[PDB]
């Protein structure tokens, strides 16, 4: 793997102590989200990482059961189209064998992006198939 210079430089820095939109308690799934947010803030584009997570979710639906146990992101063709930050984070997870935190990391990254963009998300819980009417 040949990571880009920017991600290499940011990796060595103590980004964990930098300022973030929200003060989330430290966690394994929060470190990766903080790294992704810090990497995306430099470029100023955050929707790219969201598209990468969407692609990962779509691809994972076709991968074999427990693919994360033997997952090799380098060899997987579906992840070849991801952005440099997301691919670097996936390789970092695979090195630590923590690919099961992709959902949590995506959730934390979405929370950070919404906080930065000043968006409030109101979860609506509805019965299966009852989502047709949400006017109330």
């Amino acid at each position: 793997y040949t990571p880009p210079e920017g991600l290499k430089k940011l990796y060595a820095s103590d980004f964990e102590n930098s300022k973030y939109p929200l003060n989330i308690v430290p966690s394994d799934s929060v470190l990766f989200a903080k790294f992704l947010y810090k990497a995306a803030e430099e470029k100023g584009n955050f929707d790219n990482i969201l598209s990468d997570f969407q692609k990962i979710a779509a691809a994972a639906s076709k991968l074999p059961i427990f693919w994360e146990r033997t997952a090799v992101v380098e060899k997987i063709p579906e992840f070849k189209q991801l952005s440099e930050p997301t691919f670097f984070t996936l390789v970092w997870m695979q090195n630590n064998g923590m690919l099961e935190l992709i959902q949590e990391v995506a959730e934390v990254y979405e929370t950070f992006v919404n906080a930065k963009q000043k968006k409030a998300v109101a979860k609506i819980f509805v019965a299966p198939g009852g989502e047709k009417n949400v006017e109330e």
Binding site: I24, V25, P26, S27, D28, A115
Partner: protein
């Protein structure tokens, strides 16, 4: 004019009579040694007591009632208050639980 509760996370694991919660990102958070309600149903809840506040954000809970109804992934509401039970001369002559239920 709504009975808005304070959701603090979800139920992660259940080991007998105790459970562990995971806080949803960007939520108020629960206070130590307070009572929490696990939404076993849209109208039913199971009481619990906060016992641990770990670095990871997970919360150690001591289930009090409706344990059989508790399942992983259920919503948890934080009352934000310690345990209070009915007291007075109107309780004499009755059998009650530690939670005050007759």
């Amino acid at each position: 004019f709504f009975k808005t509760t304070e959701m603090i996370g979800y139920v992660h694991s259940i080991d007998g009579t105790i459970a562990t919660l995971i806080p949803a990102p960007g939520n108020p958070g629960v206070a130590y040694n307070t009572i929490i309600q696990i939404q076993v149903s849209p109208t039913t809840f199971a009481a619990g007591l906060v016992f641990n506040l770990e670095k990871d954000g997970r919360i150690g809970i001591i289930l009090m009632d409706n344990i059989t109804e508790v399942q992983s992934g259920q919503k948890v509401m934080a009352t934000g208050q310690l345990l209070h039970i009915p007291v007075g001369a109107g309780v004499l002559g009755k059998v009650v639980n530690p939670l005050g239920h007759e």
